[PDB]
Design a protein around this ligand. Structure first.
Ligand SMILES: [Zn+2]
Ligand SMILES: [Zn+2]
Length: 127
């Protein structure tokens, strides 16, 4: 309500060589057929080349990089032992896909599913 314009700058990749290098240097979030930051599939190289050079992708990456500096409260405060040896499963006693997190012991998972940590993520997925 106090402006009518803004500045301009560019630091994005340019050409197939830059996009392939950017994918390799960020293999944990970017790939030859999917971008996790923008949670979108890239069914062909022409879509991959357009997506990684898009102004929308660059803004999404800038926001994601700023968010990727901390996290909210979680009941997983301390640990020492557990009633089961599960360490690579997908059960509710070890992980939560709504929040995309894992827990050391079933009691921590039970505490998470009834605490504010889960509810904060309900609103995140909902909106
Ligand atoms: Zn993207
Ligand atoms: Zn959860």
């Amino acid at each position: 309500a106090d402006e009518f314009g803004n500045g301009d700058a560019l630091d994005l990749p340019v050409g197939k060589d830059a996009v392939n290098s950017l994918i390799r240097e960020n293999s944990h979030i970017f790939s030859d057929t999917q971008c996790k930051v923008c949670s979108a599939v890239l069914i062909s190289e022409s879509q991959k080349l357009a997506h990684y050079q898009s102004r929308k992708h660059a803004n999404k990456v800038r926001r994601y990089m700023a968010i990727n500096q901390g996290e909210d409260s979680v009941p997983a405060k301390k640990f020492k032992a557990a009633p089961a040896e599960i360490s690579d499963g997908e059960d509710r006693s070890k992980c939560c896909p709504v929040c995309n997190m894992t827990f050391s012991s079933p009691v921590v998972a039970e505490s998470h599913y009834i605490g504010k940590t889960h509810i904060k993520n309900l609103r995140l997925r909902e909106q």
